[PDB]
RNA sequence: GUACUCUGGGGAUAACAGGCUGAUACCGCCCAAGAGUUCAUAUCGACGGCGGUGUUUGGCACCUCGAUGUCGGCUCAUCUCAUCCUGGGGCUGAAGCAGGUCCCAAGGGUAUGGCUGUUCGCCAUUUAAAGAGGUACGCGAGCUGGGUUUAGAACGUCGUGAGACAGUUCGGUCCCUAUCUACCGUGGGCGCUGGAAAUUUGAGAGGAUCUGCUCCUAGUACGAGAGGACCAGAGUGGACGAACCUCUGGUGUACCGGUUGUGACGCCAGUCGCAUCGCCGGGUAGCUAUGUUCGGAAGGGAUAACCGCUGAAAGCAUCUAAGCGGGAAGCCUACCUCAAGAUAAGAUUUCCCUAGGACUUUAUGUCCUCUAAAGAGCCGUUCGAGACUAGGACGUUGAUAGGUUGGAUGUGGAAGCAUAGUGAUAUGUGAAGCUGACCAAUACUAAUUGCUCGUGAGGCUUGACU
RNA sequence: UAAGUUCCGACCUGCACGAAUGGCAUAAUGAUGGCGGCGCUGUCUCCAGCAGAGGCUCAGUGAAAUCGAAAUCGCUGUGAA
RNA sequence: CAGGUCGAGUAGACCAAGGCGCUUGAGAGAACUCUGCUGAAGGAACUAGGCAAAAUGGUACCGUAACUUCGGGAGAAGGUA
RNA sequence: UAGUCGAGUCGGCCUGCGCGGAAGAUGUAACGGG
RNA sequence: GAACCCACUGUCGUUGAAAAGCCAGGGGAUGACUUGUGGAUAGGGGUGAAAGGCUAAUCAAGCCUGGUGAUAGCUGGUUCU
RNA sequence: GUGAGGGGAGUGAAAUAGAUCCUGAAACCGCAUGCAUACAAGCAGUGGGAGCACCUUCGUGGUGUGACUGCGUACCUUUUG
């Protein structure tokens, strides 16, 4: 099965109308003040006033 | 039926005189039969092969040979129809369910007695 | 008619003196509190609104808080309406309570609930379609729908054709159920048979419409 | 649970030994027969010089089934064999002796003679 | 449908899944801090924590059961000499699972697994 | 001669299907020799005549040969009434039962097998009944490939032969990830006269409409006897449909045990890996039918055939022209479900927002400062909700999930030690040990500090009351 | 066989058998044609549960045949029908 | 060329010396499709046709029919440990 | 055949316009619609 | 009955892993057996336990070049006012 | 990232003459500005025609857009059509 006619650019864009991306949830962690992803450990191993590494 | 309200409703109907029996035993069950307006008691004798312990939902299966034809009946333990249970023999078996007895003939279907 | 909102607790059995085993369903009932009466003058139809259960304050919006405050009752997990007539509207005022005493042993009632969700389902389960042969050369067409229409006339698929889709998780009512027990102390109704939904679901009990 | 092509043993002294169900009576598209139902059977093996011959088409009533029957208290009764009893064209038993146990669902005016001649009823 | 079912699949045979989870438990008991995928970390609790509960009491039978489950003499010895005594007065919750972003190779979500009192 | 075939062309020209026509076919009506009745337009019905349909066999070659690709079976259907069953009537060589003919009625229902590739047809056994037809002789980008139509081979027949068939026989490749319309499910956006949370009315739409048997009236009405009711009431079945897991079962590769070969843990003992979950015996939750429960009620309005009341035209008669009535599984309601995108965008309860300055295109006009509430989302722990979504609960003022503790359940006598036995093994400690999803409690672990959106009292005209 | 257009046995009017383009029969042999039986079974009444691999969602890479152009609904009728 | 345990065996299961995990992954656990396991009662009622599936299966001993071209049929059938 | 009844009425032919005869399948679909 | 040589049934694949395969079954397996290296037979010819089979993914007359721009009463196309 | 790729500085008459380097068309694909567009059915134009934005000699003007409305089934070939 295949198309009988070539689709229009307008219809292609109408189909793509649902392709937009979305932002993640970013917050400032009070311990260090660096922006971090909500509910995740910071890149330096800090979370909820605890440091995993040494 | 593990919710407390269900447990209370079921506990309201539990029997309080059941004897202790185990699969290997031979038992006699007294069954109430009402014909017309007359009620009588009929005996059902056989070897227990399976026992489900589920409170008010408990049951036990009895197998016997009647004139060369095998008959199995599953009795609901707390049903009013079951009037009395009597344990005549106690056997010695190694498994909870004895379905293998269905394929064994008379002599091969013997169950050894448990001794004190 | 005036009914009751309750919760399905589970199934069990009842033994009669004769030895009959009756399967039954248990419904927990928190007495329903009246929050509003709708009348012809103001709403255009006659009805009684009730609430049941409890809800913590953080989960109650300000508007619903004001509504329950005007009613003079504590908030509940749900709010539901009962259509009624003038005769049964008597003796019912905002702030009152309706309990299990509304029913009697032996009465015939209808029970409404939400059926279990089966998700996406095919014709075999949704519409009892017959399967095709498992062997004798069948390639990939064991549980498929098969033919779906006629030829160039009419050259389409009609509305209402049965096809695979979502099954279950809908409102369902069962009629002709007999009340087996009314426990006032425990606030419980025991009904013969099965009622729709899963354990812990919300259910509605009403007098039988068919008499 | 008896259907077409099912073999049954004979619990009476009519002369037949094995029968095959060829139809379940009592309705359109009826699938199964249980204790007390009427079936159409053919005789496959008959004792020599008996009244019933091989290849005869007769009427019969199921008296024992392996699937079993349920009772009001919720119990189930099962048997080791599938057995029926032959009947005449008026649906009345044509035998003098009944072999093996039978059940109480036959306690009707139609089968009181089976009830009487059966050794054990349960 | 899967109404009221517990367990995971993770695209492995049952024996393979059991072996992988035992390896993860041994690594956790050895190191006390690991990084893995989030679903694996979440499933690892139901396997790792009962072992600590078992090791809370030191007997020949309990040690032999732990050896049957782990197949690692060093892990058994540590469980019955260090971790059990450390958590003797704790009612469960010996592990901590912390989300740690996503992994470059396949964008898979990741988490750290740590013992409650590591140092 | 080519079926071992090939190239250039044609729907200018056949086979299938569509189109026109209706000789043929089917159905209907008009007339009335005759038959039954040796007594009735009860039922047939000679010769002859007039119509309808497009279901048969045909006629014509208008469409397709830079392809509309196939008989039957399977799966799934929709419609017509010229009605097979069920429902309501008139007449009758209608005592009753039953039958014959004709009128009304399309709501529902409307077999399993043996023989044959068959559609058919014969047969056995059922049922209330096993109706006729249209839809590309419905349905092969949904399945099959038994027949029919390639290449092999054989018999019969024809031909000198290559070969061929008003014939027969064994064997013989079924492609396509769905763009558009259509359909079944499920979301996003905006709109609905400031915004928000919840409960709702019903214009309308869909679903469901089946039927056997027993008793009772009653051996009554009727009738030489035999035989046997209308009407009315109760019960119990078949098929179909829905929900559900208390009971009976199935499964249950994260539960328990028995056991074979082999390898390993230094060895014994005790364990683990592999061999279809190695094999075997049981089995908790969940899902499920063959298991359980429930339903097709009863009613109301109009009405078809038919039956009337009163009544003139037409002094009589007449169901009709005035007026007025009864009447069916048929129609509208009634029972279940959906339903205000019903742009006609409906109703009710409660809740939130009432700051300042500058400018000109003089206005629900712009710009700056200040202020962003009621709520809704993001995120997290999750679900008896789920393809993704959507939907439900909870987020420290917590029982949302995991773990822990205690029950329950299943399996059926753990390891170690001791004793008896030459040994295989048996007994005691002890119904012990272990036990996925179940129930109750518990803050031990995780649901942190948070961010974004959503504003600042809501134009104009007329009228009623303030 | 309950029911046999197939099969086995018998009849002979052979539409249109017949003797080395061989006739009748024959033990053994055949992934050879036809008919029947025991055991067995999810082939079926009538399907249910479970295991693996896809399907679905996320991240990376990234085809196909087709295509005059499209703001690409139903019914009835008309029309190279 | 090719070892160990059992084994008639270079068949088969698990291992030694040796070699390898094979150049997209992470989740979810719908319809539908492919592969596999179990299944109540019935047991070919399926279908052109038992197609496919199910079933039998080793060693030792006993016992084994019609018909034969006297070799066979013949591991006939069937039974015991 | 009478008559207590009191004036139209009985039966035909030729013509205009109407009535029955009149059943099919996708959806009113035999005035283009109102 | 393994290796080795074959290709009887069924499923999957049919823009395949593959321009002929995989999986589960199946046949021969001391012989008219299988197989390596090197040779002979050439197109109206060769070879053929015989299917018009094979003769480099091509066979009722191989492939390449030349006659050659063959012929075509056939189909298509044929450009500004 | 001591990568690729750019920005500044400098050369040159010229650097969108910067090394797949004269000019740089079309198909196809981005960004920005103005108008229209989420109650309405079809070869997408044509004849009318309100409103809006910009430029205005403010005009009976010019440039974009086009609510609402009548009419309206592409091109070539081949054909009786």
From Swiss-Prot, chain A:
Residues 6-15 have a biased composition (Basic residues). GO terms for cellular component: large ribosomal subunit. The lineage of its organism: Bacteria, Pseudomonadati, Pseudomonadota, Gammaproteobacteria, Moraxellales. Coiled coil: none annotated. Residues 1-43 are annotated as: Disordered. It comes from the Bacteria. InterPro entries: Ribosomal_bL32, Ribosomal_bL32_bact, Ribosomal_zn-bd. Residues 24-33 have a biased composition (Polar residues). One of its GO terms (biological process) is translation. PANTHER family: 50S RIBOSOMAL PROTEIN L32 (PTHR35534), LARGE RIBOSOMAL SUBUNIT PROTEIN BL32 (PTHR35534:SF1). Belongs to the bacterial ribosomal protein bL32 family. Signal peptide: none annotated. GO terms for molecular function: structural constituent of ribosome. This is Large ribosomal subunit protein bL32. Keywords: Ribonucleoprotein, Ribosomal protein.
From Swiss-Prot, chain B:
Pfam families: Ribosomal_L19. It comes from Acinetobacter baumannii (strain AB0057). This is Large ribosomal subunit protein bL19. One of its GO terms (biological process) is translation. This protein is located at the 30S-50S ribosomal subunit interface and may play a role in the structure and function of the aminoacyl-tRNA binding site. One of its GO terms (molecular function) is structural constituent of ribosome. The gene is rplS. One of its GO terms (cellular component) is cytosolic large ribosomal subunit. The keyword Ribosomal protein applies. PROSITE patterns: RIBOSOMAL_L19. InterPro entries: Ribosomal_bL19 (IPR001857), Ribosomal_bL19_CS (IPR018257), Ribosomal_bL19_sf (IPR038657), Translation_prot_SH3-like_sf (IPR008991). The keyword DNA repair does not apply. It comes from the Bacteria. Keywords: Ribonucleoprotein, Ribosomal protein. Belongs to the bacterial ribosomal protein bL19 family.
From Swiss-Prot, chain C:
One of its GO terms (biological process) is translation. Residues 135-154 are annotated as: Disordered. One of its GO terms (cellular component) is cytosolic large ribosomal subunit. Disulfide bonds: none annotated. Keywords: Methylation, Ribonucleoprotein, Ribosomal protein, RNA-binding, rRNA-binding. The modification N5-methylglutamine is found at residue 152. It comes from the Bacteria. GO terms for molecular function: rRNA binding; structural constituent of ribosome. Methylated by PrmB. Belongs to the universal ribosomal protein uL3 family. PANTHER family: 50S RIBOSOMAL PROTEIN L3, LARGE RIBOSOMAL SUBUNIT PROTEIN UL3C. Part of the 50S ribosomal subunit. Forms a cluster with proteins L14 and L19. One of the primary rRNA binding proteins, it binds directly near the 3'-end of the 23S rRNA, where it nucleates assembly of the 50S subunit. This is Large ribosomal subunit protein uL3.
Curated annotation (Swiss-Prot), chain E:
Gene3D superfamilies: Ribosomal protein L17. PROSITE patterns: RIBOSOMAL_L17. It comes from the Bacteria. One of its GO terms (cellular component) is cytosolic large ribosomal subunit. Keywords: Ribonucleoprotein, Ribosomal protein. It holds the Pfam family Ribosomal_L17. GO terms for biological process: translation. GO terms for molecular function: structural constituent of ribosome. InterPro entries: Ribosomal_bL17, Ribosomal_bL17_CS, Ribosomal_bL17_sf. Transmembrane segments: none annotated. Part of the 50S ribosomal subunit. Contacts protein L32. Belongs to the bacterial ribosomal protein bL17 family. PANTHER family: LARGE RIBOSOMAL SUBUNIT PROTEIN BL17M (PTHR14413:SF16), RIBOSOMAL PROTEIN L17 (PTHR14413). This is Large ribosomal subunit protein bL17. It comes from Acinetobacter baumannii (strain AB0057). The gene is rplQ.
């Amino acid at each position: 099965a295949v198309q009988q006619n070539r689709k229009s650019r307008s219809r292609r864009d109408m189909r793509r109308s649902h392709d937009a991306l979305t932002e993640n949830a970013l917050t400032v962690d009070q311990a260090t003040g660096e922006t971090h992803r909500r509910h995740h450990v910071t890149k330096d191993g800090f979370y909820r006033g605890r440091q995993l590494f040494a | 039926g593990k919710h407390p309200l269900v447990q209370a409703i079921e506990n309201s109907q539990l029997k309080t005189d059941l004897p202790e029996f185990a699969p290997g035993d031979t038992v006699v069950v007294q069954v109430k039969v009402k014909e017309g307006d007359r009620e009588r008691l009929q005996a059902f004798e056989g070897v227990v092969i399976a026992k489900k312990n589920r409170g008010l939902n408990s049951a036990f299966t009895v197998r016997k040979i009647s004139s060369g034809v095998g008959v199995e009946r599953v009795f609901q333990t707390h049903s009013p129809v079951v009037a009395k249970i009597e344990v005549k023999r106690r056997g010695d078996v190694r498994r909870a369910k004895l379905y293998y007895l269905r394929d064994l003939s008379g002599k091969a279907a013997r169950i050894r007695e448990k001794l004190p | 008619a005036i009914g009751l909102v309750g919760r399905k607790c589970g199934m069990t059995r009842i033994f009669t003196d004769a030895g009959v085993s009756v399967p039954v369903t248990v419904i927990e009932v928190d007495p329903n509190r009246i929050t509003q009466i709708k009348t012809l003058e103001t709403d255009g139809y006659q009805a009684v609104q009730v609430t049941t259960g409890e809800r913590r304050e953080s989960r109650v919006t300000n508007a619903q808080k004001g509504h329950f405050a005007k009613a003079g009752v504590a908030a509940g997990r749900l709010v539901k309406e009962f259509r009624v007539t003038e005769a049964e509207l008597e003796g019912r005022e905002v702030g009152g309570t309706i309990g299990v005493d509304l029913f009697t042993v032996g009465q015939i009632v209808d029970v409404t609930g939400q059926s279990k969700g089966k998700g996406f389902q095919g014709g075999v389960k949704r519409w009892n379609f017959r399967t095709q042969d498992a062997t004798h050369g069948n390639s990939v067409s064991h549980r498929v729908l098969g033919s779906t229409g006629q030829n160039q006339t009419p050259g389409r698929v009609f509305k209402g054709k049965k096809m695979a889709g979502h099954l279950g998780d809908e409102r369902v009512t069962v009629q002709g159920l007999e009340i087996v027990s009314v426990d006032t102390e425990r606030s419980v109704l025991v009904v013969k048979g099965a009622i729709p939904g899963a354990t812990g679901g919300d259910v509605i009990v009403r007098p039988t419409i068919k008499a | 649970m008896i259907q077409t092509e099912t073999m049954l043993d004979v619990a009476d002294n009519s002369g037949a030994r094995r029968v095959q169900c060829i139809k379940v009576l009592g309705g359109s598209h009826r699938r199964y027969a249980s204790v007390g139902d009427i079936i159409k059977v053919t005789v496959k093996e008959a004792i020599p010089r008996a009244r019933v011959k091989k290849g005869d088409v007769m009427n019969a009533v199921v008296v024992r089934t392996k699937f079993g029957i349920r009772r009001p208290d919720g119990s189930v009764i099962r048997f080791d064999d599938n057995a029926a009893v032959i009947l005449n064209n008026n649906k009345a038993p044509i035998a003098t002796r009944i072999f093996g146990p039978v059940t109480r669902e036959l306690r009707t005016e139609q089968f009181m003679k089976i009830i009487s001649l059966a050794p054990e009823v349960l | 449908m899967r109404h009221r079912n517990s367990g995971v699949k993770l695209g492995r045979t049952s024996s393979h899944r059991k072996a992988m989870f035992e390896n993860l438990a041994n690594s956790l008991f050895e190191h006390e801090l690991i990084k893995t995928t989030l679903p694996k970390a979440k499933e690892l609790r139901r396997v790792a924590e009962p072992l600590i509960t078992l090791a809370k009491n030191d007997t020949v039978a309990n040690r032999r059961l732990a050896f049957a489950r782990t197949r690692n003499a060093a892990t058994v010895g540590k469980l019955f000499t260090v971790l059990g005594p450390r958590y003797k007065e704790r009612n469960g919750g010996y592990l901590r699972v912390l989300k740690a972003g996503f992994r470059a190779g396949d964008a898979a979500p990741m988490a750290y697994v740590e013992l409650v009192d590591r140092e």
